[PDB]
Design a protein around this motif. Sequence first.
Motif, PDB file in Angstrom:
ATOM      1  N   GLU A 230       0.818  -1.210   0.000  1.00  0.00           N
ATOM      2  CA  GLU A 230       0.000   0.000   0.000  1.00  0.00           C
ATOM      3  C   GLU A 230       0.854   1.262   0.000  1.00  0.00           C
ATOM      4  O   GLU A 230       0.627   2.177  -0.799  1.00  0.00           O
ATOM      5  N   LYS A 234       1.296   4.256  -3.086  1.00  0.00           N
ATOM      6  CA  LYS A 234       0.877   5.635  -2.872  1.00  0.00           C
ATOM      7  C   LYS A 234       2.040   6.607  -3.017  1.00  0.00           C
ATOM      8  O   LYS A 234       1.848   7.724  -3.510  1.00  0.00           O
ATOM      9  N   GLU A 268      -3.201  -5.527  -6.403  1.00  0.00           N
ATOM     10  CA  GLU A 268      -3.471  -4.231  -5.794  1.00  0.00           C
ATOM     11  C   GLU A 268      -3.194  -3.145  -6.818  1.00  0.00           C
ATOM     12  O   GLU A 268      -2.091  -3.080  -7.367  1.00  0.00           O
ATOM     13  N   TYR A 270      -3.874   1.235  -7.663  1.00  0.00           N
ATOM     14  CA  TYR A 270      -4.252   2.554  -7.177  1.00  0.00           C
ATOM     15  C   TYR A 270      -4.398   3.477  -8.373  1.00  0.00           C
ATOM     16  O   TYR A 270      -3.479   3.586  -9.190  1.00  0.00           O
ATOM     17  N   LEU A 401      -8.892   4.041   7.889  1.00  0.00           N
ATOM     18  CA  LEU A 401      -7.922   4.294   6.830  1.00  0.00           C
ATOM     19  C   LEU A 401      -8.558   4.814   5.544  1.00  0.00           C
ATOM     20  O   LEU A 401      -7.915   4.773   4.488  1.00  0.00           O
ATOM     21  N   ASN A 426     -11.730  -5.643  -2.362  1.00  0.00           N
ATOM     22  CA  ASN A 426     -11.782  -4.670  -1.274  1.00  0.00           C
ATOM     23  C   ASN A 426     -11.119  -3.393  -1.754  1.00  0.00           C
ATOM     24  O   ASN A 426      -9.917  -3.392  -2.036  1.00  0.00           O
ATOM     25  N   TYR A 428     -10.877   1.083  -1.366  1.00  0.00           N
ATOM     26  CA  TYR A 428     -11.021   2.209  -0.461  1.00  0.00           C
ATOM     27  C   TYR A 428     -10.885   3.501  -1.246  1.00  0.00           C
ATOM     28  O   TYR A 428     -10.253   3.535  -2.304  1.00  0.00           O
ATOM     29  N   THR A 429     -11.480   4.565  -0.723  1.00  0.00           N
ATOM     30  CA  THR A 429     -11.050   5.897  -1.106  1.00  0.00           C
ATOM     31  C   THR A 429      -9.894   6.291  -0.195  1.00  0.00           C
ATOM     32  O   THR A 429      -9.827   5.882   0.967  1.00  0.00           O
ATOM     33  N   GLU A 430      -8.956   7.050  -0.742  1.00  0.00           N
ATOM     34  CA  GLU A 430      -7.665   7.239  -0.100  1.00  0.00           C
ATOM     35  C   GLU A 430      -7.637   8.508   0.735  1.00  0.00           C
ATOM     36  O   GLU A 430      -8.181   9.543   0.338  1.00  0.00           O
ATOM     37  N   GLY A 475      -7.653   2.991  -3.699  1.00  0.00           N
ATOM     38  CA  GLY A 475      -7.010   1.696  -3.760  1.00  0.00           C
ATOM     39  C   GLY A 475      -7.987   0.580  -4.063  1.00  0.00           C
ATOM     40  O   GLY A 475      -9.197   0.776  -4.099  1.00  0.00           O
ATOM     41  N   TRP A 476      -7.433  -0.613  -4.277  1.00  0.00           N
ATOM     42  CA  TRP A 476      -8.236  -1.779  -4.624  1.00  0.00           C
ATOM     43  C   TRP A 476      -7.407  -3.044  -4.463  1.00  0.00           C
ATOM     44  O   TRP A 476      -6.248  -3.084  -4.883  1.00  0.00           O
ATOM     45  N   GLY A 477      -7.980  -4.078  -3.856  1.00  0.00           N
ATOM     46  CA  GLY A 477      -7.244  -5.307  -3.644  1.00  0.00           C
ATOM     47  C   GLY A 477      -8.085  -6.554  -3.801  1.00  0.00           C
ATOM     48  O   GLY A 477      -9.205  -6.622  -3.289  1.00  0.00           O
TER      49      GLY A 477
END
Lengths: 506, 505
Positions: A230, A234, A268, A270, A401, A426, A428-430, A475-477
């Motif tokens: 991660e 980033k 993963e 981004y 997070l 899974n 997320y917004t970062e 992100g994305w996993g």
Amino acid sequence: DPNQYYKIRSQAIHQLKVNGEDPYPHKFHVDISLTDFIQKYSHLQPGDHLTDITLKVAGRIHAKRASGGKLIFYDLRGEGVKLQVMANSRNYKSEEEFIHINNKLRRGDIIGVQGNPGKTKKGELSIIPYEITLLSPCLHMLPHLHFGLKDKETRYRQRYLDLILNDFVRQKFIIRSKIITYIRSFLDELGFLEIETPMMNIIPGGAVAKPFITYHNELDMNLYMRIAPELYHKMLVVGGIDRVYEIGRQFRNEGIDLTHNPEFTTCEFYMAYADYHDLMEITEKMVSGMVKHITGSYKVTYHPDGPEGQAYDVDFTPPFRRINMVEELEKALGMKLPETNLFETEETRKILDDICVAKAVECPPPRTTARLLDKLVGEFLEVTCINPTFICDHPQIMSPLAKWHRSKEGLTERFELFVMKKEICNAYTELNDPMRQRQLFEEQAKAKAAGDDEAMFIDENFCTALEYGLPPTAGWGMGIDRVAMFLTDSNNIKEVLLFPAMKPED
Amino acid sequence: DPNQYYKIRSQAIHQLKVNGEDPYPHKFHVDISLTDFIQKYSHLQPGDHLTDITLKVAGRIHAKRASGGKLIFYDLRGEGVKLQVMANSRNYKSEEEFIHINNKLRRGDIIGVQGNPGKTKKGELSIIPYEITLLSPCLHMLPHLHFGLKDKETRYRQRYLDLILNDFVRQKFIIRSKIITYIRSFLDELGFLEIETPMMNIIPGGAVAKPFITYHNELDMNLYMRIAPELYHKMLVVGGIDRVYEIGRQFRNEGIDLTHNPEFTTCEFYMAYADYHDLMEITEKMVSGMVKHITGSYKVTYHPDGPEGQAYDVDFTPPFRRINMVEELEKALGMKLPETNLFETEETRKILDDICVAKAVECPPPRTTARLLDKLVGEFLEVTCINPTFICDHPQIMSPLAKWHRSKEGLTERFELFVMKKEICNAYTELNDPMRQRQLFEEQAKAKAAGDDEAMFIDENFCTALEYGLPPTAGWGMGIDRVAMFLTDSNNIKEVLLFPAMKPE
RNA sequence: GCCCGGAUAGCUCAGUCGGUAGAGCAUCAGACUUUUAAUCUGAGGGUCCAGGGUUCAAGUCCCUGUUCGGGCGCCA
Ligand SMILES: Nc1ncnc2c1ncn2[C@@H]1O[C@H](COP(=O)(O)O)[C@@H](O)[C@H]1O
Ligand SMILES: Nc1ncnc2c1ncn2[C@@H]1O[C@H](COP(=O)(O)O)[C@@H](O)[C@H]1O
Ligand SMILES: N[C@@H](CCCC[NH3+])C(=O)O
Ligand SMILES: N[C@@H](CCCC[NH3+])C(=O)O
Ligand code: NA
């Protein structure tokens, strides 16, 4: 001692090597594969003999049927396909050579057959050899086990034996490789850049997951294996590359379950100037195209309890079901859950414990606000999503997070793709705010710190990167193994693992 | 000043956050990428102003040129694509917003621009902004230099700064990705199957090196890190998968220098019913295709040390040069070289030692017949391979995992491809004999016990797999990092690594 | 870390109380020139994961240990 086959075979091969005979030739010129041989010479009528045509094929003998002193039938098995080898001394080079070469061939041996194609009187495709060449003899006994090998211990310890006897494991591994190839193609077509971040970082960082401590002799200091890429992704996004991805291995020193392995492969990516809302559509296209391309139908049959257990028919129609977990949990519990604003307070914890007791939900003696709520979600939400389903924003108590919700208050922006009551994706917004990220890391370091230890559980290098300005990314996993399990009707992660970890027999 | 700049910018950002405005908006729907914008609107003639289409683009400010108070020129930076934003008060939303947005934007801040494309009379593409949104302020003071951070240390320790100030680094990573992508497809279209072998094993195997030792909590035991996936690939080939390949990482517990890293990527494939002369064509075709597809031509100019010194010009013309190793060393060596095909006893080590001492060649105390021979070849015959060259028919004691030569005695059926006096890829003919392999393992273990440190152990499972029957195969391995250095004109392994390991200092 | 299950001839399985452990596959030697889980005739083989115990007597009864198949935990 006829049963002691290994000693007899070893003595025989030693005699062959001594007596001017090489049982390990360096090169055999294979002309056509078994699959192409079967596909081409299938139009022949029964009892045909293409004397003019001469080819060379190689494979492992799986059966040796002797219909007489001059006619012996072999069964080459390679490329997952089988080809009979009718050995007739009349069509051989000579009777003496026929006897000499048939006295050495046994089940499991690897041979190179050079002979004309043809078919027997029973309409079975075969190749009438002109010169059988022994390539690599098999010393150990090869069991004639019907219905394939069915012992987990031998199947996982000796993967080569599993591949030789069972044939579906090859299909499983082929499907896993295609999955990986499809993900690579899709992400590369979208414009992403494949990267290789370090797998041996310098500090543990803020990770509750136990790392794999490794000692470096020259550096005279401990190195910790990568838990998640991660941070490096980033830091790359800050650099200017707005779309990165990496299908690499992760190392988590934890327990082993049916769906959990200490070492596993994940994808993963981004992407800058996006969010989870912009990512659910991409995930939909990913999964729908994966199922349509790897299989032949959007529908996949899965057996979570083995072949004899209950069968489930999941459907990968692109419009996946989307649910906001707050409303769905309220509906399932049939009660008004406290407003997300109070979630950090004690009375919400108390009342959630009341729900856990009333609705018969178990929880460990530590009963913090995030964990019992996760328990209610596990028994009242994902337990019903046989089909792929998107779970929307989760309470901030789960994982802080992610950035704060645009409209809702106290709701992290995230989604998890659940298939067969298991999460596969899974995203997320970062969080790109340096101060909030610093406070989060400080809190994680205080939680992870065994004593008065700081910085070690933080990434100042990364906290400096965010101070230079990170765009709003997402992100994305995805767990590659957790998807290969569902696409291969597999209920155990070790079935898709090539060489699963096994303790020494000793 | 940098500390003062950071403090002032942090205070300003805190004040902005206090006064309602959020400097970190959740979303900004970019309509068109910067490269697509440039390619679509480069056709305009100078002076126009398309006051009909509104487009939203985002990027990092690289320069803020001021022309009075009514005209400010910005300079966005995309993926190696520069677009100039000219902010005009008349065409902006309002004068008050103009002042309020120009009083908060500084160099390095990430902004989102929405407005009409255009072009001034000078003739550079511009977007006339209707409103400018600050997405991510840059608190630290970005160094403004006309050359880009040249301090490799900072360039390596802070790769984001390198990418922000230097674009060549981005391309270096693009070429690296292209190399790996091409290789996978080349093997894919050949019919190979991509595999993921374990990274942690009971004992190391596949190569000869010092491993990393870890600890496993669930299975209470010590597990070594992967050195080479060779053994698992051979077990797979025994299983029935004829062609396998894997591009993955390997770990070595050695020192960190300008051309060595604790972790590195290598490409390994194994095809059955082949030999080391069958890969002579496959490897050559793959390397020629890689060079032609990435560079665009068959000739590459490489600077071994610095972009100002000597610049040897290599030529990847598909008919690569092919020479023997022992015979060519015999020709190169002024004195006669012992037959040494059946001679590997103390006498051979003795003659190699006197030759090594006489040629002023220094070798580690072991001075092993193999450690002597590799040093001698690498100091005498190695430096002629400016162009790609094959060096085949190595002595047996050099590689313990290669089948004996079908004709030559005590020689391994292996070759090495050498370009720019460096090894990029080597391949053997796999030794499928179980007894011979067990002997070789026993001698390796005896050497390890006696005075060796990085030699291998006995792997009984691999011996059993060989006992079950391995077809005649040929393995092939290649270090991705070396080819990345050669194709991107880099003399350091740090340049081709995103976040290379450095001394903690 | 905590519980529930197993391990038998090279290997797939039988073996009732505590009163040796058996059959097929495979292997070896023969007969059969159109088989396909080829067929027929002969030959072998083990302390029942490893130890202690319990007993006149243990594969069986009990304890520990190795190693697998599961469940709950860990992976905020
Ligand atoms: N121990 C594990 N074993 C197998 N798959 C895992 C494991 N941990 C995580 N995954 C997969 O990796 C995905 C992403 O994990 P994460 O990046 O931690 O959010 C999960 O949704 C799982 O599919
Ligand atoms: N200690 C090391 N650190 C980094 N790369 C290494 C190291 N040792 C070997 N290599 C790489 O391994 C390559 C050779 O790989 P191979 O031809 O498969 O044996 C070299 O060209 C290097 O790029
Ligand atoms: N890399 C994370 C997503 C982003 C993490 C930080 N928001 C994952 O795969 O789950
Ligand atoms: N990967 C091997 C050589 C190539 C594959 C040969 N089996 C090594 O460098 O050790
Ligand atoms: Na019989």
